[PDB]
UniProtKB/Swiss-Prot annotation, chain B:
Organism: Oryctolagus cuniculus
Recorded name of the encoding gene: RPS9
Database matches in PROSITE patterns: RIBOSOMAL_S4, S4
Subcellular location: Cytoplasm; Nucleus, Nucleolus
Protein name, entry field: Small ribosomal subunit protein uS4
Lineage of origin: Eukaryota, Metazoa, Chordata, Craniata, Vertebrata
GO terms classed as biological process: ribosomal small subunit biogenesis; translation
Subunit structure: Component of the small ribosomal subunit. Identified in a IGF2BP1-dependent mRNP granule complex containing untranslated mRNAs. Part of the small subunit (SSU) processome, composed of more than 70 proteins and the RNA chaperone small nucleolar RNA (snoRNA) U3.
Curated annotation (Swiss-Prot), chain C:
Function comment: Component of the ribosome, a large ribonucleoprotein complex responsible for the synthesis of proteins in the cell. The small ribosomal subunit (SSU) binds messenger RNAs (mRNAs) and translates the encoded message by selecting cognate aminoacyl-transfer RNA (tRNA) molecules. The large subunit (LSU) contains the ribosomal catalytic site termed the peptidyl transferase center (PTC), which catalyzes the formation of peptide bonds, thereby polymerizing the amino acids delivered by tRNAs into a polypeptide chain.
Residues modified as 3-hydroxyproline: 61
Compartment list: Cytoplasm, Cytosol; Cytoplasm; Rough endoplasmic reticulum; Nucleus, Nucleolus
Family membership noted in the UniProt record: Belongs to the universal ribosomal protein uS12 family.
Biological processes annotated in GO: translation
Keyword Ubl conjugation: yes
Lineage of the species this protein comes from: Eukaryota, Metazoa, Chordata, Craniata, Vertebrata
Record PROSITE patterns: RIBOSOMAL_S12
Protein's name in the database: Small ribosomal subunit protein uS12
Gene that encodes the chain: RPS23
PANTHER family per the UniProt record, alphabetical: 30S RIBOSOMAL PROTEIN S12 FAMILY MEMBER
CC per GO annotation: cytosolic ribosome; nucleolus; rough endoplasmic reticulum; small ribosomal subunit
UniProtKB/Swiss-Prot annotation, chain D:
Coverage span on the entire protein: 79 to 133 of 133
Highest taxon, organism lineage: Eukaryota
Cell compartment(s), UniProt: Cytoplasm; Nucleus
Name recorded for this polypeptide: Small ribosomal subunit protein eS30
Species for this entry: Oryctolagus cuniculus
Role played: Component of the 40S subunit of the ribosome. Contributes to the assembly and function of 40S ribosomal subunits.
Subunit text: Component of the 40S subunit of the ribosome.
RNA sequence: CACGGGUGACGGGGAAUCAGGGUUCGAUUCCGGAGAGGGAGCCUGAGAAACGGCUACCACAUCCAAGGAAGGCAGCAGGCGCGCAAAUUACCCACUCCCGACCCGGGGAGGUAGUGACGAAAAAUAACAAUACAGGACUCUUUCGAGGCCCUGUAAUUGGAAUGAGUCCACUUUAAAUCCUUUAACGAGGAUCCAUUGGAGGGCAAGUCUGGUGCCAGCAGCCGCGGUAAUUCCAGCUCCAA
């Protein structure tokens, strides 16, 4: 029942990708999870699903169509080289530090008081 | 300095005299003959029709054979033909001054649902539209003030997922049927 | 217009300025004498402390005691007379408490049978006076 | 004399408001107004009386 | 119309009202000026008379061992005060850009949420059928009365249908969330899942209804009401306006 189509397909080889806008027709169902259609793109474009990146899914008023954006990578090593870090983390390839932004700021201003190799000491 | 628009606009205007019997009774006909909700719906239609008249009147005083006398003349006429308030053979920009606000209330989705026969009364039509039972070219429309273009006027039918279409029964029938079998055994 | 030359714009314009000062409403808005005479200072509302509770006679054809309150403004210290509007509402106002006052309707002019008041009470002790009449709220004790 | 304040509001009788059925709102209210005034009524003799006319 | 004075005067692009002319507003996100408690003087630097740079004096104010040291929220929050009068001591550099030796670091610029009836757009609070009735065009009928092919409205009468407010699995959204959108399961009979705010003498739409008060209390923007049959006060019922 779920059928996907691609519009505005275009290959940019200076970023080693090929990106398109994805249209999903899922009549009567909730919005299809992204992990489900990365398979369908993989079958459609003859590649492994782990280099498949999709985002920006908006379901139209009425509940039968969803238009998102997708982009297909030549290799996983290229993908890690030029990709937003937050979008790799959704797939698990990246883990950002769990240091709060506020915490980093007062630690900056404490090291500023001290001079010399004791700059490293005052941190924790 | 922020990144947003702030561009807004009022769509109506209140009349100057609040308590005129002649005016009160004339806009009570429309609000009951078309099943409207308050006077502000009537007022915003008088206001849009007043923009069309105000545009034409300043165009009419313009000397004919002016490029904007023609370009904005035809554009204004083409828009009114597309929505069906001005019929095709009668389109020259002195003919839109003789135009009534009942013609614009004619082209509402609420009125059309009545005339296509999908509803029983003009009030019943407004109920179906709000309850998501009407679609226009594979697109359910949730509002009775949707204005119908002449070309899409023949594509109004029930929505695919509707008990009045080919869909599931609603809560009432599903619950009554379940209790019927639940009470029987 | 009386003078109708092409080169008489200075004559016509400078004659409007002189003759606009004989307009009474123009005269008071564009002079500082009226603004400094206003107890409010040009505001729509003002708060003050109750000094005493007073009642004035009305006027020649009428005959009734108008329940009023003598209030001293906070921003200035000026003393004005306000009119507790509704029927029996004077009970809710006691001496030495804070009230919110507003104009009485006619832009600094006396209104109706009450002689020489320009002001009215809308809130006492930070609770609306109309709400006390309706019983929706009670005096904060 | 400041002693007679609140005189009438106090000495007047106290009558509770009787319970009454709710009033239809929005489009239904204007639908009722249309029927009571334009489609149901018939012209009468001479001058017509008002909506709240009573004897 | 100099000079002097006042301005509740930062200027402009613009805003409100508007027939044609005009009148009033512009502290306020874009451009330009000025200023960092008040004045004055400088260092470095291409660029400063810089204040999240320095030096004085004036005012205010902090720590102190009483010898001294330190200060500038008209930045983001937040607090006191003033007042008629104005929000969180939140999350993030993911977007827009800027800075640096820089593809990598940083940015209370800026973004995202919270409060938010300033204001602007859309838009629920019922729909339908059956009985009883009441009218209407119809017929017969002198009318009355009756036939309903035809309606139209009304009735805390009966009846099954349709939904979203809400609860909430998930997906989607997103830097991470939230909201919207999609979608399971529950979710409407007094559908109590109960619409208010002002009025009913005139202007000005709408009761000479009933009970109370008796020039008192009160109402009334104006005209005026009230003195023992108040259409105007205080209440109940009914009606009007949005
Ligand atoms: Mg100034
Ligand atoms: Mg300015
Ligand atoms: Mg400067
Ligand atoms: Mg300061
Ligand atoms: Mg300086
Ligand atoms: Mg600072
Ligand atoms: Mg600076
Ligand atoms: Mg405010
Ligand atoms: Mg950034
Ligand atoms: Mg960075
Ligand atoms: Mg900011
Ligand atoms: Mg409600
Ligand atoms: Mg009354
Ligand atoms: Mg009136
Ligand atoms: Mg009248
Ligand atoms: Mg009146």
């Amino acid at each position: 029942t779920v059928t996907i189509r691609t519009r505005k397909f275009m290959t940019n080889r200076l970023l080693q990708r090929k990106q398109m806008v994805i249209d999903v027709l899922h009549p009567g169902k909730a919005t299809v999870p992204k992990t489900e259609i990365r398979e369908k793109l993989a079958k459609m474009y003859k590649t492994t699903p782990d280099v498949i990146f999709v985002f920006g899914f908006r379901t139209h008023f009425g509940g039968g169509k969803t238009t998102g954006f997708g982009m297909i990578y030549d290799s996983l090593d290229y993908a890690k080289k030029n990709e937003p870090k937050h979008r790799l983390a959704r797939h698990g390839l990246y883990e950002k530090k769990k240091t709060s932004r506020k915490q980093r700021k007062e630690r900056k201003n404490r090291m500023k008081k001290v001079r010399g190799t004791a700059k490293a000491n005052v941190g924790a | 300095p922020v990144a947003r628009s702030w561009v807004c606009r009022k769509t109506y205007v209140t009349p100057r005299r609040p308590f005129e019997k002649s005016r009160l009774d004339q806009e009570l006909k429309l609000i009951g003959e078309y099943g409207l909700r308050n006077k502000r719906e009537v007022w915003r239609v008088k206001f849009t029709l007043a923009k069309i008249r105000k545009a034409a009147r300043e165009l009419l005083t313009l000397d004919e054979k002016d490029p904007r006398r023609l370009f904005e003349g035809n554009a204004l006429l083409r828009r009114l033909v597309r929505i069906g308030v001005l019929d095709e053979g009668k389109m020259k920009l002195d003919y839109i001054l003789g135009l009534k606000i009942e013609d614009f209330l004619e082209r509402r989705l609420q009125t059309q649902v009545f005339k296509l026969g999908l509803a029983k009364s003009i009030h019943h039509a407004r109920v179906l539209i709000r309850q998501r039972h009407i679609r226009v070219r594979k697109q359910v429309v949730n509002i009775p003030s949707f204005i119908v273009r002449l070309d899409s006027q023949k594509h109004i039918d029930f929505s695919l997922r509707s008990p009045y279409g080919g869909g599931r029964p609603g809560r009432v029938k599903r619950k009554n049927a379940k209790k019927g079998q639940g009470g029987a055994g | 217009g009386k003078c109708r030359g092409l080169r008489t714009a200075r004559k016509l314009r400078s004659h409007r300025r002189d003759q606009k000062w004989h307009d009474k409403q123009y005269k008071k808005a564009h002079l500082g004498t009226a603004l400094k005479a206003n107890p409010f200072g040009g505001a729509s509302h003002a708060k003050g402390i109750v000094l005493e509770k007073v009642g004035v006679e009305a006027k020649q054809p009428n005959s009734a005691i108008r329940k009023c309150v003598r209030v001293q403004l906070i921003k200035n210290g000026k003393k004005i007379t306000a009119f507790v509007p509704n029927d029996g509402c004077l009970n809710f106002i006691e001496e030495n408490d804070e009230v919110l006052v507003a104009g009485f309707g006619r832009k600094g002019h006396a209104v109706g049978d009450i002689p020489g008041v320009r002001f009215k009470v809308v809130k006492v002790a930070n609770v609306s006076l109309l709400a006390l009449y309706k019983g929706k709220k009670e005096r904060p004790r | 004399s400041l002693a007679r304040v609140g005189k009438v509001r106090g000495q007047t009788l106290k009558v509770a408001k009787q319970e009454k059925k709710k009033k239809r709102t929005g489009r239904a209210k204007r639908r009722m107004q249309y029927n009571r005034r334009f489609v149901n009524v018939v012209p009468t003799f001479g001058k017509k009386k008002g909506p709240n006319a009573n004897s």
